[PDB]
């Protein structure tokens, strides 16, 4: 048991599995750049989205938590609240 | 029943039981890509109807969709092993020890980490330095009589941390 | 020092008195304050509450007390000894709860059912008896040394 | 003067003593008696401890 | 040293192993070195122990009482008769109550010398033991608690007396 | 025995003529030295008690409760600090010779042969109690809880006095033997019912029986831990002792005329078990636990069994152990958070770490650890009751799985799970109180090993 | 099997209810046979610790096995064809006890129907 | 982050399956015969285990 | 296409089908804001008697000691003898102790008769 | 016979070091946990052989001394048989249980 | 740079009442075994001879410990 | 090998110093279930012979 976790490679992480989904684009798709106001994909498939990283990394995240991501930075914001991830 | 709102929406409520119902899905569902057809047809439900503003055709499909919800659900779902309920569900809530503590040692095993308990004195002067007047200030100038809320503002005013920051700040690592 | 008056002696009426008290007391609701009422069973003048209260109150809240679900000011339930996660589950059941009941009873009642007509209606292969030569063990049973020698043998077939 | 003078001690005082409540001359006794009794015929543990030739029963 | 006559010890019986085999013999190397790392040295220090209780010796002794009479024997009250005399009859309860358990004791070895095969040869031992016991079980049973010696000689007195009558109307 | 008495007459003045700052190390010294002087007296054989100075002797139902009486002394005047080491030195002289007495006339009632002098020591054994829990309780109810025990002990305990005159001057004296060597079986009247249930209803105050009962918790959930321990421990030990004393008398009406109280007995046991599942108030398991256990106790004296005796003394001997320990454990949490309630110290096995062990060690004696002697006390009380009747096994066994929840109940709850972490007031575990963690639970694991020496005169 | 099927479906006649096997008389379809050997030699028997409920017939061959499994222990698959002779004697000793049911059983068949036909 | 390059869990799952191939009929080999073995079945009644399993 | 979910004293009712949660009025609405003004003000000094440096003992839960006072203590004022306390008093109390008295007067009278018949299975009895 | 009874009281003992190890401890052994592995592996090593010895022949036996509370008509001490189930029931027990002291030192290394 | 700060407890207090506990049982245990051990084994026990003819004894010569 | 050497040897001594001398002065202890003779054994003991198992046949 022994994952090793740190700024940047999760942040790869997550920018690599938001340019995998196929419906967004991955021109303008920037670190912070957001997911209703801009891209224009509406709440259920962002709330796909957050099932996607939830699939991915191991953890659910609470629906008063989910109203408030909204894009990719805030996303690695609370993920590294959840697993403490600096040194 | 949350912090900041008073009540969730109906939005909201919409939304938490599509995120139920995914997740029921996925329990119920093996293989992974016959969940993946059965999760957009499940969206194609939601897609039938979902350019209506009836507010109370909306509710009433609401009330029919917890009905199908609760017919067909799954028995255990598949909870994440730090979910409630989980597997661990703060497995190491054993070795999560307060920081409000540590400082009731010997000195002379104080004296046998020195630069950390050095640092945790500037840390705690830190913490006593800016507690009195900034942030009582700014609790009792800028709430009303009643509060009602519980998001404290963070301290935009002029210097030092926002406030009531230590037993939150001071959290321990979730894996020690 | 506390004060004597933040205890609850008396019961609940009258209307204006009582309900006051409890809502500024038990920093509730004015009308959801509600007493037993009156059944004379002591309970003094504490609310009811609606009694489940443990597997709800989401974990996702994140209030004081992490695993007791409280909030530091409530009004303290009164069976709340009764029902701490790890004493009763009041969950919603998937099902129902008389239909649970009714399938149980049923499984158990038919085991023990045929386990009676099985209890009337043994097994047997076609098979004689343990011939035992020396009078049916006799000498090696619990005793009679020379008492009575009591010829019983097998036959050839 | 709780510990190594008083419970250490205590321990050997009550580990040997003599027969606490009599039991080993009890042990060598009923040996002697048992080797007796079987040996000169006599029946091991008679009933009627005290001899009915020593009673003067109430009649009718 | 134990006597003999009183625990009774059966013939032994032991045959001896005869191979047939060529793996060959674990337990012969085992038991070789066995005796020789373990039943030499501390047969050595064993001895040199026994030659420091041969240095000086000691002795003890049984405690041997007299016989004072009876209890049927005493008068009304007379305490320092009963005195002597419920001390002897307690006595005599300790030893009786020892006396069951080396009946007891001997029922086990019985039992477990034959092995698997119990149901013959422990015939007399069960025997002694359901006579004794029947002994036990007439004289000295349901008195309870306080036995002083007068509940025993009450019980006695009401056992001869139920017999007196069973013979009366049985003769 | 004279020379048992007579040091603890003359280790009174100590207190009083030795300095401040220099009584504590004198006091604790010279009553472990005659600790050891009490453990010499163990010379019992065979044959009769060790009958002396006409007034005095010692049977095996006297010798183990008074070695445990003069060694639960100096035990507990260590354990009774912190709580006023703040108090002046005049009240705490007081306090301190005012144990000492208590112990004097403790030793005056278990080597008791005149049954008129063994009343006299009874409700001298009460009176100083008083005076302990109700000067220096430290709660607000402490003063109706000194009342209600005076008046329950006095007026149970009062009538056994007329009844004990009247044997006096209706047969002759009052020795055990010569109470013994002459006793008549009386008939059943009623007047011989009012006798029997004159003292055996003294004794049922004193235990106390399930129907008299809250005598007890209130008693000892607002006393000092000095006055808590006595009394559990030392008082409902010296109520059974005194029963197993009186019971040799009317032996042949007790078989008819003591039914109900098997009943009341056994029902109340099972009642108490299940009301200590439930309470807040860590305090008060512990005197519910010791209800159970004198209800367990009673029923093996209304039995008449050797079996059912020794059970009866090794129970008694045991639980005065476990539960005197057990209230310490609750004094060093209490001491630790102002609180007295249970569910606010929540946590304390991160914390305060080998505590744990102490706990751990003392709720699986309450247990029935499968070695300890609760269990070699209720087990043989469990087979004397079986050959009593072939059906009271249920309600003992029930009470076995109550009191195993009840225990696991107070260890999982007390001391597991979470720290609730707005506390930071407790510090690492002192050696004062590891000291008495080991003075507790040393002669019960010796005792564990070698238990014949306390078993019952019926051996 | 079939007479299982028989006996709880059918009548409960023709199928001697068991555990009291003899029913019919002994020498009767024998007439003057019966040798019952039985070479186990009782007091050697009871001097050899064998359990009760194996001190049963052809327990000699038991007694062949004990021997050679004794003298050659870390022989590992040495000692079988006793041990199969003793199953062999065994399994003729289940054949034995089948061939008296159905003794029993053609008995309480062909008599009780031919006295219950012409009665 | 599959990983059992560990010589302790190889030697505790290789003396386990060791125990769990041959050690049976070590075992069921020289036991002390201290029952008396039934032996003589009909067809399907030692079949019907293979028989139930394989179904 | 349900059965619809009755609750019993056990089977909670969750928060979907309620269905209270639907009809909603103003006073609903008004009783969630003050019931969230509640839990704010309780949170507000909470969290001020929380994070304070000079505090050294517990935050002194006040609701915690008058539910202990509640339970405990403050049972018996106020308490009056009434036909329901009484009844279910008498019943509670009384009635499995005399049940027990007449299932022991019951086996000890059979054990009883079975002695004086004097064939008890005393073959060896001997620790009674 | 001596050897016999002594191996399987020494089976017994060897059960009771560690215990005794940690009780003089007063100290961080980063090597107890081998201590145990290693004192359990020597226990099964000299339990398998007794086992041996009953299937060679037998000599079925128990033990018993240091009586303790023989109070009224019965008595109690220590008192172990070794027979069939007794014996061939060790070795298995001490096998398994030493492979999970192995796995435990893997699975739970890290706490 | 992988190591953290683990919070402990704290160890200081336990394993101080801890050693000076086995030091104060070691303190007259081990001379106590010391001695139970040259008394059993450099005197000897007794020997169980019966009483001579024309002896009294006293109350001890009834033991075979000799501290007993 | 140090701790092969007390943990086979030192008990291994306290044992069997154990298991002679004081625990065969206690009377009834240990005991042996008997080995098991066979019509073609002889005794180790004294040395006297059983006569052999009879006739085989019918197999
Ligand atoms: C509880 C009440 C117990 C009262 C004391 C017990 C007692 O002596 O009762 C018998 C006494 C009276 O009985 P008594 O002890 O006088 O017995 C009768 C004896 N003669 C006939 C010689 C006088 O009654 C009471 O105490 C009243 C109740």
Not at chain 1, 15 to 24: A, C, E, S
Not at chain 1, 62 to 67: G, L, R, S, W
Not at chain 2, 164 to 170: A, G, S
Not at chain 11, 42 to 62: K, Q, T
Request: aromatic letters at 12%.
């Amino acid at each position: 048991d022994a994952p090793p976790l740190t700024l940047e490679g999760i942040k790869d992480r997550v920018l690599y599995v938001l340019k995998l989904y196929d419906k967004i684009d991955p021109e303008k798709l920037s670190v912070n750049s957001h997911f209703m106001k801009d891209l224009g994909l509406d709440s259920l498939d962002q709330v796909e989205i957050i099932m996607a990283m939830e699939d991915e990394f191991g953890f659910e995240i609470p629906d008063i938590d989910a109203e408030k991501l909204m894009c990719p930075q805030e996303i690695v914001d609370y993920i590294a609240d959840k697993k403490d991830v600096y040194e | 029943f949350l912090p900041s709102a008073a009540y969730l929406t109906h939005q909201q409520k919409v939304l938490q039981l599509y995120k139920r119902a995914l997740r029921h899905l996925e329990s119920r569902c093996v293989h992974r890509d016959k969940y993946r057809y059965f999760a957009c047809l499940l969206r194609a439900r939601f897609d039938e109807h979902k350019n209506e503003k009836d507010m109370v055709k909306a509710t009433q499909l609401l009330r029919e969709a917890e009905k199908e919800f609760w017919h067909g659900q799954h028995p255990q779902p598949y909870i994440f092993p730090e979910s409630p309920g989980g597997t661990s569900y703060e497995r190491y809530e054993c070795y999560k020890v307060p920081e409000w503590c540590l400082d009731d040692w010997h000195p002379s095993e104080k004296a046998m980490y020195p630069d950390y308990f050095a640092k945790r004195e500037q840390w705690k002067k830190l913490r006593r330095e800016s507690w009195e007047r900034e942030v009582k200030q700014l609790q009792e100038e800028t709430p009303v009589g009643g509060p009602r809320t519980e998001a404290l503002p963070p301290a935009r005013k002029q210097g030092d941390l926002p406030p009531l920051w230590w037993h939150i700040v001071t959290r321990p690592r979730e894996r020690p | 020092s506390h004060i004597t008056k933040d205890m609850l002696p008396g019961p609940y009426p009258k209307t204006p008195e009582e309900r006051a008290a409890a809502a500024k007391k038990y920093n509730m609701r004015v009308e959801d304050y509600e007493p037993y009422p009156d059944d004379g069973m002591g309970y003094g003048d504490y609310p009811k509450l609606p009694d489940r209260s443990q597997q709800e109150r989401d974990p996702w809240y994140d209030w004081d007390h992490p695993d007791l679900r409280l909030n530091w000011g409530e009004p303290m339930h009164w069976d709340l000894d009764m029902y701490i996660r790890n004493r009763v589950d009041t969950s919603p059941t998937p099902v129902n709860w008389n239909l649970m009941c009714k399938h149980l009873f049923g499984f158990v009642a038919f085991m023990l059912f045929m386990f009676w007509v099985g209890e009337t209606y043994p097994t047997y292969q076609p098979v004689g008896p343990k011939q035992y030569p020396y009078n049916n063990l006799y000498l090696e049973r619990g005793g009679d040394p020379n008492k009575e020698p009591e010829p019983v043998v097998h036959y050839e077939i | 003067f709780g510990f190594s003078i008083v419970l250490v001690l205590g321990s050997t005082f009550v580990a040997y003593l003599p027969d606490y409540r009599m039991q080993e001359w009890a042990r060598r006794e009923a040996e002697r008696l048992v080797k007796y009794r079987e040996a000169h015929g006599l029946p091991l543990m008679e009933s009627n401890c005290f001899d009915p030739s020593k009673i003067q029963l109430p009649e009718d | 040293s134990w006597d003999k006559d009183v625990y009774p010890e059966p013939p032994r019986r032991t045959p001896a192993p005869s191979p047939q085999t060529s793996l060959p013999n674990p337990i012969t190397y085992l038991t070789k070195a066995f005796d020789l790392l373990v039943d030499r040295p501390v047969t050595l220090v064993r001895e040199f122990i026994e030659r420091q209780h041969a240095k000086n010796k000691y002795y003890y002794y049984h405690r041997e009482f007299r016989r004072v009479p009876d209890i049927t024997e005493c008068h009304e009250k007379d305490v320092l008769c009963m005195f002597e005399a419920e001390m002897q009859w307690k006595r005599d309860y300790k030893v009786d109550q020892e006396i069951v358990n080396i009946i007891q004791e001997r029922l086990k070895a019985c039992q477990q010398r034959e092995g698997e095969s119990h149901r013959q040869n422990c015939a007399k031992e069960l025997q002694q033991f359901t006579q004794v016991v029947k002994a036990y079980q007439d004289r000295y049973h349901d008195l309870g608690a306080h036995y002083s010696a007068r509940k025993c000689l009450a019980k006695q007195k009401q056992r001869m007396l139920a017999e007196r009558k069973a013979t009366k109307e049985a003769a | 025995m004279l020379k048992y008495i007579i040091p603890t007459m003359m280790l009174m003045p100590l207190t009083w003529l030795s300095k401040n700052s220099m009584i504590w190390i004198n006091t604790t010294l010279h009553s472990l030295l005659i600790s050891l002087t009490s453990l010499l007296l163990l010379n019992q054989f065979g044959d009769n008690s060790l009958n002396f100075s006409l007034t005095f002797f010692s049977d095996s139902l006297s010798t183990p409760l008074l070695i445990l009486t003069m060694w639960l002394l100096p035990l507990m005047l260590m354990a009774s600090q912190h709580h006023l080491s703040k108090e002046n030195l005049a009240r705490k002289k007081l306090f301190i010779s005012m144990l000492i007495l208590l112990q004097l006339f403790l030793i005056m009632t278990f080597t008791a042969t005149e049954l008129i002098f063994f009343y006299i020591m009874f409700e001298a054994t009460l009176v100083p109690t008083l005076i302990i829990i109700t000067r220096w309780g430290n709660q607000t109810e402490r003063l109706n809880a000194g009342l209600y025990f005076l008046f329950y002990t006095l007026a149970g305990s009062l009538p056994l006095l007329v009844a004990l005159i009247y044997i006096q001057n209706t047969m002759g004296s009052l020795n055990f033997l010569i109470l013994q060597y002459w006793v008549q079986p009386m008939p059943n009247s009623w007047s011989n019912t009012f006798m029997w249930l004159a003292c055996m209803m003294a004794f049922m105050v004193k235990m106390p029986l399930y129907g008299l009962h809250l005598w007890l918790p209130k008693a000892h959930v607002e006393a000092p831990i000095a006055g808590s321990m006595v009394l559990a421990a030392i008082l409902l030990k010296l109520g059974g002792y005194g029963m197993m004393r009186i019971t040799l008398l009317l032996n042949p009406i007790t078989d008819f005329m003591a039914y109900p109280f098997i009943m009341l007995s056994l029902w109340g046991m099972i009642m108490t078990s299940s009301i200590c599942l439930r309470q807040t108030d860590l305090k008060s398991l512990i005197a519910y636990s010791s209800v159970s256990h004198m209800a367990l106790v009673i029923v093996a004296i209304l039995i008449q069994t050797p079996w059912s005796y020794m059970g009866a003394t090794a129970l008694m001997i045991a639980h005065g152990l476990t539960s005197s320990m057990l209230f310490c454990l609750a004094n060093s949490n209490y001491e630790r958070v102002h609180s007295r309630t249970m569910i606010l110290a929540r946590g304390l096995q991160t914390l305060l770490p080998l505590m744990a062990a102490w706990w751990l060690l003392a709720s699986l004696t309450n247990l029935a650890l499968p070695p300890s002697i609760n269990l070699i006390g209720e087990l043989f009380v469990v087979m004397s009751t079986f050959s009593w009747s072939n059906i009271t096994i249920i309600l003992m066994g029930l009470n076995m799985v109550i009191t195993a929840l009840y225990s696991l109940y107070m260890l999982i709850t007390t001391q597991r799970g979470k720290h609730t972490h707005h506390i930071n007031n407790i510090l690492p575990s002192f050696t004062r109180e590891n000291a008495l963690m080991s003075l507790h639970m040393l002669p019960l694991l010796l005792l564990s090993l070698n238990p014949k020496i306390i078993l019952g005169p019926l051996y | 099997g079939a007479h299982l099927a028989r006996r709880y479906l059918g009548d409960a006649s023709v199928e001697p209810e068991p555990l009291r096997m003899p029913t019919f008389p002994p020498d009767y379809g024998f007439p003057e046979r019966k040798e019952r050997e039985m070479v186990a030699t009782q007091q050697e028997m009871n001097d050899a610790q064998l359990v009760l409920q194996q001190r049963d017939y052809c327990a000699h061959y038991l007694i062949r096995f004990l021997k050679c499994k004794r003298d050659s222990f870390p022989n590992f698959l040495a000692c079988k064809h006793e041990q199969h002779d003793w199953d062999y004697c065994e399994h003729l000793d289940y054949v034995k006890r089948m061939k008296e049911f159905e003794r029993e059983r053609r008995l309480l068949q062909r008599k009780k129907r031919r006295e219950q036909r012409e009665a | 982050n599959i990983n059992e390059n560990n010589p302790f869990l190889i030697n505790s799952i290789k003396r386990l399956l060791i125990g769990s191939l041959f050690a049976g009929f070590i075992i069921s080999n020289n036991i002390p015969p201290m029952t008396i073995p039934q032996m003589t079945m009909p067809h399907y009644l030692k079949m019907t285990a293979l028989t139930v399993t394989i179904l | 296409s349900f059965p619809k979910y009755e609750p019993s004293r056990l089977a909670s009712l969750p928060t979907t089908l309620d269905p209270a949660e639907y009809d909603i009025s103003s006073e609903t609405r008004k009783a969630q804001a003050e019931r969230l003004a509640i839990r704010s003000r309780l949170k507000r000094e909470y969290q001020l008697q929380y994070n304070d440096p000079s505090r050294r003992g517990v935050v002194e839960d006040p609701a915690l000691i008058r539910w202990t006072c509640a339970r405990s203590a403050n049972v018996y004022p106020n308490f009056r003898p009434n036909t329901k306390t009484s009844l279910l008093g008498a019943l509670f109390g009384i009635g499995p102790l005399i049940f027990w008295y007449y299932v022991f007067k019951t086996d000890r009278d059979r054990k009883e008769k079975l002695i004086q018949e004097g064939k008890l299975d005393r073959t060896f009895n001997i620790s009674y | 016979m001596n050897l016999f009874s002594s191996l399987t009281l020494v089976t017994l003992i060897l059960l009771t070091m560690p215990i005794a190890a940690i009780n003089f401890n007063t100290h961080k052994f980063t090597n107890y946990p081998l201590y145990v592995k290693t004192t359990i592996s020597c226990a099964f090593i000299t339990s398998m052989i007794p086992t041996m010895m009953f299937i060679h022949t037998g000599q079925e036996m128990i033990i018993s001394n240091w009586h303790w509370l023989t109070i009224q008509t019965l008595k109690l001490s220590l008192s172990f048989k070794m027979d069939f189930f007794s014996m061939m029931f060790v070795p298995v027990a001490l096998f398994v249980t030493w492979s999970i002291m192995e796995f435990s030192m893997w699975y739970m290394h890290s706490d | 740079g992988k190591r953290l700060f683990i919070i402990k407890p704290s160890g200081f207090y336990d394993k101080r009442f801890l050693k000076l506990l086995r030091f104060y049982i070691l303190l007259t245990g081990i001379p106590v075994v010391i001695g139970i051990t040259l008394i059993n084994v450099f005197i000897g026990e007794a020997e169980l001879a019966e009483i001579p003819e024309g002896y009294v004894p006293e109350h001890w010569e009834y033991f075979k410990h000799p501290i007993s | 090998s140090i701790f092969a050497f007390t943990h086979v040897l030192i008990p291994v001594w306290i044992i069997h110093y154990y298991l002679k001398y004081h625990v065969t002065t206690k009377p009834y202890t240990i005991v042996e279930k008997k080995p098991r003779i066979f019509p073609g054994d002889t005794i180790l003991e004294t040395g006297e012979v059983i006569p052999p198992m009879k006739e085989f046949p019918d197999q």
